[PDB]
Homo-oligomer: 205 residues x 4
């Protein structure tokens, strides 16, 4: 596309996009065009407004575009063209990316004992309400644990809320502990674009 | 994919999908899996149910899957696997395609007079509330008018309702009437995937 | 989107799109913009050309846009803006939809005998090389046969060529013939957006 | 979907996916199913193979699935079901995500002088050949520069190669230098999903 300002917009929150170069208040010669999950190619929005789009996005008195509560379908491109009192045309181009932060992840199941030298199910971590999905990461004593790296295995499931579209992640960690290591290791789970309480199992030689 | 029964489901209407080979009532060994606009790959649904999915699709006592009101996002694939009393497994595979019929199309503007031998704007037709979009067709004396036929030109605009996702179509017809033709032709507009407009009958000058 | 001319373009065939209002030959003040399966939002193409896009679409001397062989990814929107010798701006807007016609469908398996009053597998029809997929229809004595209509059952499979993206369809027809009907019915299969040879089984009362 | 091993596969490189629990060599009771950019829902692949798919993915003697050179359209889900000698079934489920690393980013234009207290165009950075697109980040004296921070503005353009589908990024940085700061700041550009540019060191006037 064209040169644009990247905007990250949280779902459920308002968004105001500036129409650069527009007169401070009406009358203004300006037009907004957007191409999002709600449109078939470009949709034109004018200061007059009207219709179904008045429930979604409206042009404010200062010419800015206002969305009262961003949704997944508002991802896309938003552009304004305005004329100033003289007659200079000014363009504003925005690439809008939407997101949602999940709740704190939690460990829903965990082993209290691990046996060194054999594979063990360490635990299951769940995260609810992210957009886009993201992924869950595991940590050992505060250091990242790399999946499928000869001893560490991670499997993950992604499910979508049928109405909101937000993602729930469920990740399972298996480890083969090395003999002669820490007997009370600390494991934790985090959401990769917060972190869980650490679980502290016992390891046997 | 696999061999499936094609199902067409109207938006807003209920849908019942049969789980072939399931026992008539509980207990039943059966499982539904669906992959639609609402899922990340396959979602498993069981007779027990529960959770957010109970507002969208639930397994009935006879093992069928029931959606109270189909939406655009229910397009996709729906499968059941069941075991009968004897113990034979039976699979059911459905490809669900969703649609909505628009209201009757309307002519929102039309010429009352056309001049033969020059291009004329005949009229504008609008259709609201289709899914998928479809297209608008023009007719002259009950015969189809083919766009871009050296004399017939058609332009069309498709807009999407920002909350329902249903389409509104707006089509403009221009024609160059041939000298020595019908002086009172009849034009009509139709929705193409009743649904035809009242005909307009302008006057043509030689 | 905006008011556009709908263009249907066959895959593998050239496409020429007119830039209305452009001067007949250079120099011309004109610009093409396209948004297709090949682009991230709008891509601008100029008469000078250059780069990777010269293998796909180029502006001709008369200002028209030329694609030597349309592919699936050329579906989308194509627009031109030009200035004439005076200075009138003219816009051209095209919505391009791509397709491919399959080969003649064929019956790959068929019953030679049907028993009235019970379900029978009548036959299997295959169509190769369509885009978009389309569907296969069955006919009895030249009349359409409606699927899942208490006596008629149709199942269909759609597969995609891994490299070309063209679709292969396979449809199976089952019928429960009505007692006291035609003893030598004629069935045929057709591609719905040609037709097969009719199969003519024998029916028993 | 279901519980799966996440696999990251570089475009143009081979990929081997293990069919867990399959016998080491034929005969094997196993089946692969994949749903990717190349398929309409699930495609079944067998050890026998054959057809157009033999140019893309084939089952090896040990039952693993092999793709000689991954492409963008191989993103998706790959599953195996096998039976061992005893007779136990084992399933393998993979979620395959494809990527490509761009070339080293470059500064294609830069200011040699900046004026404190006014907005200045610092430079333009370009990255070619990423998948998915990614983004370009700017740094000042090794610290991240946050866009739209009342004084820092960044605009970016993403273009797609019309035949390979790989992305080219172009990012422009503008800053309003604060009076009384470093007179020879160092700016650099980096690719964000080595891959950092040489730093530019303009002069700033008070
Ligand atoms: C490249 C670029 C950046 C910012 C705005 C625009 C507009 C536009 C937006 C609203 C109204 C009229 C024109 C256009 C166009 O459509 O030509 N291009 C733009
Ligand atoms: C090819 C085909 C047709 C109809 C149903 C299925 C199921 C299934 C559906 C629900 C529960 C368990 C299995 C599967 C599978 O997943 O193997 N394949 C199927
Ligand atoms: C609504 C409509 C119809 C046909 C062409 C255009 C262009 C355009 C195309 C190429 C170059 C410059 C402008 C624009 C725009 O971008 O404003 N809108 C258009
Ligand atoms: C949930 C899950 C994990 C891994 C493999 C499978 C298979 C499968 C794959 C290839 C062949 C036969 C079955 C199925 C199914 O289709 O039921 N479900 C699976
Ligand atoms: O929608 C509107 C409302 C008022 C004036 C207007 O005029 C412009 C058209 C295009 C670009 C800039 C200005 C457009
Ligand atoms: O975009 C919207 C959507 C709904 C209503 C609306 O009208 C307002 C007037 C004053 C304050 C806030 C909103 C504007
Ligand atoms: O035929 C099947 C296939 C898979 C599982 C199954 O067992 C279930 C019973 C109730 C609910 C969900 C699953 C029965
Ligand atoms: O790409 C080009 C090449 C030459 C002239 C030109 O000037 C225009 C810009 C936009 C619209 C119409 C004309 C654009
Ligand atoms: O769009 C293209 C693509 C490849 C080559 C090309 O150059 C030609 C010159 C003369 C005749 C035909 C083609 C134009
Ligand atoms: O474990 C399985 C699951 C499904 C089918 C199967 O039998 C096949 C043997 C060879 C090739 C394809 C299928 C074995
Ligand atoms: Cl899901
Ligand atoms: Cl729209
Ligand atoms: Cl397929
Ligand atoms: Cl592009």
């Amino acid at each position: 596309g064209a040169m644009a300002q990247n905007i990250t917009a949280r779902i459920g929150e308002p968004l105001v996009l500036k129409c650069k170069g527009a007169p401070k208040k009406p009358p203004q010669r300006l037009e907004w065009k957007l191409n999002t999950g709600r449109t078939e190619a470009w949709k034109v929005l004018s200061p007059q407004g009207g219709g179904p789009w008045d429930s979604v996005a409206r042009v404010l008195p200062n010419g800015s575009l206002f969305l009262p509560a961003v949704g997944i379908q508002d991802e896309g491109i938003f552009r304004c063209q305005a004329m100033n009192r003289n007659g200079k045309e000014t363009k504003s181009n925005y690439r809008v990316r939407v997101y949602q932060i999940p709740g704190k992840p939690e460990i829903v199941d965990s082993a209290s004992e691990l046996t060194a030298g054999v594979p063990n199910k360490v635990g299951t971590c769940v995260s609810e309400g992210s957009y886009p999905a993201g992924t869950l990461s595991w940590h050992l004593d505060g250091k990242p644990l790399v999946p499928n790296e000869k001893g560490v295995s991670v499997k993950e499931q992604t499910r979508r809320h049928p109405e909101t579209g937000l993602f729930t992640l469920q990740s399972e960690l298996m480890v083969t502990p090395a003999r002669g290591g820490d007997p009370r290791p600390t494991f934790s789970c985090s959401f990769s674009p917060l972190r869980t309480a650490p679980i502290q199992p016992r390891v046997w030689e």
